[PDB]
Design an enzyme around this catalytic site. Structure first.
Site, short mmCIF file in Angstrom:
data_model
loop_
_atom_site.label_atom_id
_atom_site.label_comp_id
_atom_site.label_asym_id
_atom_site.label_seq_id
_atom_site.Cartn_x
_atom_site.Cartn_y
_atom_site.Cartn_z
N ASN A 1 8.43 -15.08 32.38
CA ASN A 1 7.66 -14.70 33.69
C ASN A 1 7.96 -16.30 34.33
O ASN A 1 7.12 -17.22 33.93
CB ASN A 1 6.50 -14.39 33.71
CG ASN A 1 6.19 -12.95 33.07
OD1 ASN A 1 7.24 -12.13 32.77
ND2 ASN A 1 4.86 -12.59 33.27
N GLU B 1 9.30 -11.28 34.91
CA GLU B 1 8.70 -11.24 36.17
C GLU B 1 9.55 -12.60 36.84
O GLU B 1 9.58 -13.45 36.23
CB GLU B 1 7.50 -11.63 36.33
CG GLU B 1 6.49 -10.58 35.78
CD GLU B 1 5.00 -10.74 35.95
OE1 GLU B 1 4.71 -11.39 36.54
OE2 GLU B 1 4.19 -9.69 35.11
N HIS C 1 -2.10 -6.05 29.57
CA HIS C 1 -1.75 -6.89 31.08
C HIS C 1 -3.17 -6.88 31.73
O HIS C 1 -3.31 -6.70 32.94
CB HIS C 1 -0.54 -6.14 31.83
CG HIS C 1 0.11 -7.29 32.81
ND1 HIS C 1 1.22 -6.96 33.12
CD2 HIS C 1 -0.55 -7.82 33.64
CE1 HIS C 1 1.56 -7.84 34.19
NE2 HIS C 1 0.56 -8.42 34.57
N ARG D 1 9.54 -2.14 33.97
CA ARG D 1 8.64 -2.71 33.14
C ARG D 1 7.26 -2.24 33.70
O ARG D 1 6.87 -2.48 35.12
CB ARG D 1 8.63 -4.28 33.21
CG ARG D 1 7.53 -4.93 32.57
CD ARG D 1 7.85 -6.37 32.21
NE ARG D 1 6.53 -6.97 31.45
CZ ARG D 1 5.75 -7.80 32.05
NH1 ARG D 1 6.01 -8.45 33.35
NH2 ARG D 1 4.52 -8.13 31.50
N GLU E 1 1.52 -12.87 29.49
CA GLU E 1 1.04 -14.27 29.88
C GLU E 1 -0.38 -14.92 29.22
O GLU E 1 -1.25 -15.04 29.51
CB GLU E 1 0.95 -14.49 31.43
CG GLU E 1 2.12 -13.98 31.86
CD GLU E 1 2.24 -14.24 33.45
OE1 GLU E 1 1.22 -14.40 33.96
OE2 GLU E 1 2.99 -13.98 34.30
N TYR F 1 8.65 -18.69 38.20
CA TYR F 1 8.09 -18.37 39.49
C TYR F 1 8.48 -19.79 40.27
O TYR F 1 8.87 -19.78 41.40
CB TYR F 1 6.76 -17.94 39.97
CG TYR F 1 6.49 -16.39 39.60
CD1 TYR F 1 6.69 -15.46 40.54
CD2 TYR F 1 6.04 -16.19 38.46
CE1 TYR F 1 6.59 -14.40 40.29
CE2 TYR F 1 5.57 -15.05 38.22
CZ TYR F 1 5.94 -13.73 39.10
OH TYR F 1 5.62 -12.56 38.74
O1 LIG Z 1 0.66 -15.97 36.68
C1 LIG Z 1 -0.16 -16.93 37.58
C2 LIG Z 1 -1.01 -16.32 38.74
O2 LIG Z 1 -1.15 -15.05 38.80
C3 LIG Z 1 -2.17 -17.47 39.42
O3 LIG Z 1 -2.46 -17.46 40.68
O4 LIG Z 1 -2.11 -19.02 38.64
C4 LIG Z 1 -0.74 -19.20 38.22
C5 LIG Z 1 0.55 -18.22 38.01
O5 LIG Z 1 1.80 -18.65 37.27
O1 LIG Z 2 0.85 -9.77 37.31
C1 LIG Z 2 1.65 -10.93 37.75
C2 LIG Z 2 1.61 -12.28 36.51
O2 LIG Z 2 2.06 -11.54 35.44
C3 LIG Z 2 2.21 -13.58 37.60
O3 LIG Z 2 2.10 -15.01 37.07
O4 LIG Z 2 1.43 -13.63 38.66
C4 LIG Z 2 1.55 -12.98 39.59
C5 LIG Z 2 1.06 -11.43 39.27
O5 LIG Z 2 1.94 -10.71 40.39
#
Ligand SMILES: O[C@@H]1[C@@H](O)[C@H](O)OC[C@H]1O
Ligand SMILES: O[C@@H]1[C@@H](O)[C@H](O)OC[C@H]1O
Length: 444
Positions: A292, A351, A120, A76, A165, A294
């Site tokens: 995506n 992601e 992006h 990707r 995003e 986290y």
């Molecule tokens: O994608 C986003 C990141 O790049 C930013 O720091 O704040 C929220 C995250 O999920």
């Molecule tokens: O591009 C990335 C983004 O999509 C994520 O939320 O924030 C971290 C970055 O690395």
């Protein structure tokens, strides 16, 4: 008992153009809104810019040979608008199209499926000066770029993501002033959020018209698991507002042609520039929904965020170097919510990854056991989602390699491959050597 993924499962890595390419003036590329934002004092934590980054513009073949070592069957990446149409519209920069042709041919030659993100975050500056996201004219500008690039590559690229995003583009770019173009206004963020959705829906039939029966397209949403800090009515309502703001603001329009009504009221419904026919455009059928993921975000009633009347709480647990809580159950939870509420025909994780402090040992190795444990728990959550019948078709680790992490600059390292910026040396991390085994076994 917790072993193998489906036989055609797509294991990949993800990057974006501004984060890795460098060569920001090379071959007719014009400045992006990020080239200009990196000039702002205080915008990037370490004072860095993406001017050089990983120099992937020059080093792409070496990076694709690393992908082959990792055994990924998918990759990707994003396409830089400023390389394709440097004046924002009109004249195609042939040499910019040529870079992505060479990149796509080098990937298919190595048996790696290309997954191309159109937007992006790197709009050309000259195009932002005419149409910022809060100006409805941005939609046709994005569709023109989509048309140009898909005409050139759709013989070889089957998987297309429209925009990465929408929440980040709109809220961090126009509502919080943390990302390019660095504005901070509730109305501008809501206009930009709407125009991102409309650019998604108007691009969709152009991708399909320029492709073939194999062409698949969708949008990429960032989504996090939201948790109330307590059972207090004030805290449950704070969590519901934050969930509406972060997770439902884009998903509800995309599947149900409506914004979350309670939050729309809270903001002022007239601030969103909805025209007749807009929700028919936004709901244009997609082949997949890309996610995506986290972290878990825990919310209480408070005044930290004056816009939403919330404060953030850190539960006892494990945190990355970004101060993001490690919560792999959240990934199952998000996938299950999307499956039950919206039934996308296919899901991708486009992601997921972690930033921890990395060091090269005397022996030249990068021992990252916390990043490895992060990935193992999230892969295990994805495996559970698949066993529950959720149509998860692929998983892309963020990132192939350490890169420019936007407002955090280069100090936050997300790669499963370490980059020594002094030399551009790539070193596959312990987590990368482990992933090399997951991809080949198609499982844990
Ligand atoms: O994608 C986003 C990141 O790049 C930013 O720091 O704040 C929220 C995250 O999920
Ligand atoms: O591009 C990335 C983004 O999509 C994520 O939320 O924030 C971290 C970055 O690395």
């Amino acid at each position: 008992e917790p072993h193998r993924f489906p036989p055609d499962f797509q294991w990949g890595v993800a990057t974006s153009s501004y984060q890795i390419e460098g060569a920001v003036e090379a071959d007719g590329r014009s400045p992006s809104i990020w080239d200009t934002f990196c000039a702002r004092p205080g915008a990037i934590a370490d004072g860095s810019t993406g001017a050089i980054a990983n120099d992937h513009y020059h080093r792409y073949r070496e990076d694709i040979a690393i992908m082959k070592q990792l055994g990924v069957n998918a990759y990707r990446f994003s396409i830089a608008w400023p390389r394709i149409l440097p004046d924002g519209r009109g004249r195609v920069n042939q040499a910019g199209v040529d870079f992505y042709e060479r990149l796509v041919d080098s990937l298919l030659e190595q048996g790696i499926e290309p997954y191309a993100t159109l937007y992006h975050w790197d709009m050309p500056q000259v195009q932002h000066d005419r149409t910022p996201w809060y100006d409805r004219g941005v939609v046709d500008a994005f569709v023109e770029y989509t048309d140009v690039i898909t005409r050139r590559l759709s013989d070889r690229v089957k998987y297309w993501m429209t925009l990465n995003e929408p929440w980040v583009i709109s809220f961090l770019g126009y509502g919080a002033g943390e990302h390019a173009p660095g504005l901070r206004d509730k109305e501008l963020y809501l206009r930009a959020a709407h125009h991102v959705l409309l650019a998604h829906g108007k691009a969709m039939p152009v991708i399909r018209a320029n492709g073939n029966a194999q062409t698949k397209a969708g949008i990429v949403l960032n989504l996090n698991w939201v948790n109330a800090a307590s059972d207090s009515p004030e805290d449950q309502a704070a969590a519901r507002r934050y969930d509406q703001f972060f997770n439902r603001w884009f998903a509800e329009p995309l599947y149900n042609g409506r914004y979350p009504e309670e939050l729309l009221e809270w903001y002022g419904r007239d601030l969103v520039p909805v025209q007749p026919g807009d929700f028919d455009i936004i709901t244009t059928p997609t082949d997949f929904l890309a996610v995506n993921y986290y972290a878990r975000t825990t919310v209480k009633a408070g005044s930290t965020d004056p816009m939403l009347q919330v404060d953030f709480v850190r539960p006892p647990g494990e945190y990355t170097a970004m101060d993001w809580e490690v919560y792999p159950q959240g990934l199952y939870n998000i996938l299950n919510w999307l499956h039950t509420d919206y039934a996308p025909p296919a899901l991708y994780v486009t992601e997921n990854g972690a930033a921890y402090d990395d060091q090269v040992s005397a022996a030249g190795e990068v021992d990252d056991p916390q990043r490895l444990a992060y990935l193992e728990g999230h892969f295990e959550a994805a495996y559970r989602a698949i066993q529950a019948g959720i149509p998860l078709k692929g998983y892309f680790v963020w990132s192939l390699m350490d890169n420019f992490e936007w407002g955090r600059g280069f100090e936050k390292r997300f790669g499963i491959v370490f980059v020594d910026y002094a030399t551009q040396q790539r070193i596959i991390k312990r987590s990368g050597k482990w992933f090399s085994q997951v991809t080949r076994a198609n499982g844990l």
